[PDB]
């Protein structure tokens, strides 16, 4: 479809292009406006308003465009490069590398942004745990293969730190790739800091950055770009999924994807729905998070970060996000103030895979009893702070001691990210977490003071440090 049209209307980041009566571009067909030299503006067709007129979102500056400019139809949605050539590179919404390196090249396979999800036959009937290395994540709210996990928290609780240490864990300890979709990524927070963090984490002769793809829909971009960056990262990850690999896509803020969709719908003149949101919120979430599944060939596990507006979990954006979630990891500022870097609240982190018949019979006894002990501590904390531990009877003093031990034991140094409290790499497996927490839950740790459990290992590091200090 080499059809050439002309720009008819320009209203903000929403343009209209008049084409011939035949060969009109389809919906999501990525028209392109040359701007001189090699620069071009890639718009995405959203509506067909009659005789050859298509309404599209700019996905670019569109601040120097005149009416009547030539527009080239591409005949397909936005084409982004896929393959090993995308590893170690940073892309915008259009798949153009926004790092210092040059273009990808014409010999690299390009794929459309808008694909269909895996069919009904391709879905995996039986779920499977995804080991991630983190103690609290693998124990309390375990991941699922081809599933969605959402991390919550405040502005500075450490969600991005958790995301990047998970990227490092996936890249270094196992030979697996990951794709990071920085939707609404600040040009300071992610466009240099995350690159430095990924290029600082090194295993041998290569970095964690070398085993991950990055697609940055920065905040300065128009709402269409921040809307389509998630699908761009999905397209770049589905290649490795088609090779049978287990990709773990990360999403910087799925709420900013929702807000980009709402802004795009408002700019197109559509009637608002719910709390001023787009009418197509459910379908827009489905077209993204139904491509994150466990195919019979390969799998895409995903980890989103969700911003909850006004701490309202019944808000339509968290309501629609929660419909697709398989696990939740709640970060609390209170835990962060106690110098706990993995500030995961085990009493607020859930997972659908936490079942006796999937993650193990001992898993859904150790996790259940750990949660019960922590709930007992949460109940008794006010009494302890007001009165003191002397009022607590037996079976409650021991419970509080074990609860403090596990609460301080959930902390990890994230030695892969920088070298803060650096120590030999552990990457504690799921079975090791189960065995350590069953060990402490069955006593065997009461002689340890409640200060050794800090950035520790697998409860064998705890006893090793106890023997080293004084034994």
């Amino acid at each position: 479809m080499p059809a050439k049209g002309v720009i008819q209307e320009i209203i903000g980041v929403v343009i209209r292009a008049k084409f011939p009566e035949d060969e009109v571009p389809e919906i999501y067909n990525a028209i392109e406006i040359p701007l001189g030299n090699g620069d071009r503006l890639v718009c995405e067709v959203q509506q067909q308003l009659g005789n050859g007129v298509v309404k599209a979102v700019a996905m670019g500056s569109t601040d120097g465009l005149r009416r009547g400019l030539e527009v080239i139809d591409t005949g397909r949605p936005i084409a982004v490069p896929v393959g090993p050539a995308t590893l170690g590179r940073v892309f915008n919404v259009l798949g153009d590398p926004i790092d210092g390196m040059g273009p990808i090249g014409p010999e690299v396979e390009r794929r459309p942004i808008h694909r269909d999800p895996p069919s009904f036959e391709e879905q995996n009937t039986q779920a499977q745990i995804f080991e991630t290395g983190i103690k609290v994540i693998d124990l309390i709210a375990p991941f699922t293969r081809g599933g969605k996990t959402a991390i919550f928290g405040g502005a500075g609780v450490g969600k991005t730190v958790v995301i990047q240490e998970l990227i490092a864990n996936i890249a270094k300890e196992q030979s697996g790739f990951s794709v990071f979709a920085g939707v609404g990524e600040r040009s300071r927070e992610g466009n240099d800091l995350i690159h430095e963090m990924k290029e600082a984490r090194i295993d041998e002769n290569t970095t964690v950055f070398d085993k991950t793809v990055m697609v940055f829909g920065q905040m300065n971009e128009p709402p269409g770009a921040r809307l389509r960056v998630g699908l761009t990262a999905l397209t770049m990850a589905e290649y490795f999924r088609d090779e049978g690999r287990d990709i773990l896509l990360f999403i910087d803020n799925i709420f900013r994807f929702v807000q980009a969709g709402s802004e795009v719908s408002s700019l197109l003149g559509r009637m608002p729905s719910q709390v001023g949101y787009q009418p197509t919120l459910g379908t827009e979430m489905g077209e993204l998070q139904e491509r994150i599944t466990s195919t019979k060939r390969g799998s895409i596990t995903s980890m989103q970060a969700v911003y909850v507006p006004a701490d309202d979990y019944t808000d339509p954006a968290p309501a629609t996000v929660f419909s697709h979630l398989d696990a939740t990891i709640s970060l609390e500022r209170s835990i962060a103030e106690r110098a706990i870097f993995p500030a995961v609240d085990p009493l607020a982190s859930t997972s659908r895979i936490l079942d006796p018949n999937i993650v193990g019979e001992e898993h859904y006894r150790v996790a259940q009893e750990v949660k019960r002990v922590l709930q007992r501590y949460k109940d008794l904390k006010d009494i302890i702070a007001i009165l003191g531990m002397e009022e607590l009877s037996d079976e409650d003093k021991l419970t509080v001691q074990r609860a403090r031990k596990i609460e301080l034991f959930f902390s990890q140094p994230f030695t892969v990210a920088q070298q803060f409290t650096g120590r030999p790499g552990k990457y504690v497996p799921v079975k090791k977490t189960v065995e350590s927490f069953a060990r402490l839950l069955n006593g065997e740790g009461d002689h340890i003071p409640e200060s050794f459990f800090y950035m520790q290992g697998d409860f064998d590091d705890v006893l090793a440090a106890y023997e080293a200090s004084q034994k």
């Binding site: 008819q8 209307e9 320009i10 209203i11 903000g12 980041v13 209209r16 500056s61 569109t62 601040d63 120097g64 465009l65 005149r66 009416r67 009547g68 940073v90 926004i98 790092d99 210092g100 405040g154 502005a155 500075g156 609404g184 600040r186 040009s187 300071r188 927070e189 466009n191 240099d192 800091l193 690159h195 430095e196 940055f216 920065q218 905040m219 300065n220 128009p222 709402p223 900013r256 807000q259 709402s262 802004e263 795009v264 719908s265 408002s266 700019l267 197109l268 003149g269 608002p272 709390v275 001023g276 911003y307 507006p309 006004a310 103030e337």
Partner: protein, 520 residues
């Protein structure tokens, strides 16, 4: 030869054979409808989006009122009038200037109050300049930036110790009604007297009297030697208020990329304050609704998160490859009854790196900077602090968090045990320490010394209502009896192990000498 011969040699080239006397069919537009600051033009097909149009002078009007061609609809150009809408009439000629909006930039704008178009309004003569920078440009990008390391010293102990602001960091100041947001911004501007940083103040949608008072405050403290005051007041059209912060940040990006000679030193660091982004968003909402663009939540247009983001993502910290300069943004947001979850507040909060929350409850309770430490964050953190402040303010942050956990027991402290009463008294003394008078910023050495005195057990003897006075007196002591202690603290403020025995012993001796010779 004479220099006038060189002057004539410059002439007699364009004078004789340098002018093209060719008449050409230039495409102009005719006005078909004038609204409430929006004029629609029939045919102007040689116009780009956001291009400044002229409206050339006509009978009874000896000046041209420019506009901004925003809606390039099919056979229609809706342009928002920058000046006054009364003079524009149906059938008026409109000539496309062929240019996007640009503002004069450079050394000449230093101490000048200017329009968003760059025209001076201070009445101090024309702006001297040789370069114009475009209003709208893309942010520096991905590889251009650098991690924020250099601190911006606002002079407020609470901000500089708990909510660090670094060069290249977008730190929102969000408050409500009269809580001192402009006071905090002006205090930050006044503290850059010799810090090698050029300040810019935008003042979108304010009073002419308020901007005049701000300029008078700046020029009575000598701050206009390095400050640029853009001004789009309340009476001015919504187009000027819409383009004011972009003009300010264009000047700031000129400072960042090239730099200016300030005090004989090249300065490439700029601190910009958008004193009302809520008013800027209101002005752009008026522009969009008068253009009949489809509204969204709270009647704001769809591209209102985009609006501010273009403005705020231009504040960067460039690496040494791209000059090493920086632009620091201090947006100001006014909430309504502390409605943090409103549209524009959430937009700016998500965009900006950190937030500074000002509460009316603290303002009316005597807290002179009405800063809410509990909810306000700076995600850059310790990287935007000196090593001295990093070493000292950690215990201050911990003690203040402990006090905020126990704030309900403050009036009951006489009936509690020893440790809880001690924590409450320490928190009360620290909160009284953070109270600062207006227009009195403190240097980093003074803040470090005061916070070291407070962090260690030295303010326990002096009662709470005198803590502030103690601080003032101590500073006077350090300003008169021991300048060497202040110089020593300032000299090794970048040392990784800041409390070296030399500076530690000097500071302890100064504190003991002050306490022994003073009574409270």
């Amino acid at each position: 030869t004479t220099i006038t011969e060189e002057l004539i040699a410059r002439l007699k080239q364009g004078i004789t054979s340098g002018v093209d006397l060719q008449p050409r069919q230039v495409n102009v537009g005719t006005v078909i409808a004038v609204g409430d600051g929006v004029a629609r033009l029939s045919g102007l097909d040689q116009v780009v989006a956001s291009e400044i149009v002229e409206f050339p002078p006509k009978a009874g009007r000896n000046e041209s009122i420019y506009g901004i061609a925003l809606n390039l609809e099919q056979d229609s150009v809706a342009a928002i009038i920058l000046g006054d809408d009364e003079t524009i009439e149906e059938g008026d000629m409109v000539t496309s200037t062929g240019r996007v909006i640009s503002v004069p930039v450079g050394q000449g704008l230093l101490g000048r109050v200017v329009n968003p178009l760059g025209q001076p309004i201070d009445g101090k003569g024309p702006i001297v300049y040789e370069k114009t920078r475009p209003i709208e440009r893309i942010a520096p990008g991905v590889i251009t930036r650098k991690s924020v390391d250099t601190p911006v010293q606002t002079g407020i102990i609470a901000i500089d110790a708990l909510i660090p602001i670094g060069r290249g960091q977008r730190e929102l100041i969000i408050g409500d009604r009269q809580t001192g947001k402009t006071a905090v911004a002006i205090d930050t501007i006044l503290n850059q007297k010799g810090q090698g940083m050029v300040c810019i103040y935008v003042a979108i949608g304010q009073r002419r009297a308020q901007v005049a008072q701000v300029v008078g405050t700046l020029e009575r403290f000598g701050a206009m030697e390095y400050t640029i005051v853009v001004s789009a007041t309340a009476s001015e059209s919504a187009a000027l208020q819409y383009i004011a912060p972009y003009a300010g940040c264009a000047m700031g990006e000129e400072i960042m990329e090239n730099g200016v000679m300030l005090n004989g030193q090249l300065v490439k660091d700029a601190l910009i304050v958008y004193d009302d982004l809520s008013k800027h968003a209101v002005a752009y909402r008026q522009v969009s609704l008068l253009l009949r663009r489809p509204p969204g939540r709270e009647a704001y247009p769809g591209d209102v998160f985009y609006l501010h983001s273009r403005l705020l993502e231009r504040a960067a910290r460039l690496n040494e490859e791209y000059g090493g300069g920086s632009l620091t943004a201090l947006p100001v947001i006014e909430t309504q009854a502390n409605d943090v979850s409103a549209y524009i507040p959430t937009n700016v909060i998500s965009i900006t790196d950190g937030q500074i929350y000002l509460e009316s409850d603290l303002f009316n309770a005597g807290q002179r900077p009405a800063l809410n430490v509990g909810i306000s964050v700076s995600r850059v953190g310790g990287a935007a602090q000196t090593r001295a402040m990093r070493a000292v303010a950690g215990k201050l942050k911990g003690e203040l968090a402990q006090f905020r956990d126990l704030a309900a027991f403050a009036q009951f402290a006489s009936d509690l045990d020893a440790t809880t009463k001690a924590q409450i008294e320490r928190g009360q003394r620290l909160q009284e320490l953070l109270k600062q008078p207006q227009y009195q910023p403190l240097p980093v050495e003074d803040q470090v010394a005061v916070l070291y005195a407070a962090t260690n057990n030295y303010l326990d003897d002096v009662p709470v209502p005198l803590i502030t006075k103690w601080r003032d007196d101590f500073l006077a002591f350090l300003r008169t009896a021991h300048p060497e202690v202040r110089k020593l603290i300032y000299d090794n403020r970048l040392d990784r192990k800041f409390p070296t025995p030399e500076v530690k012993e000097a500071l302890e001796a100064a504190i003991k000498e002050f306490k022994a010779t003073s009574n409270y």
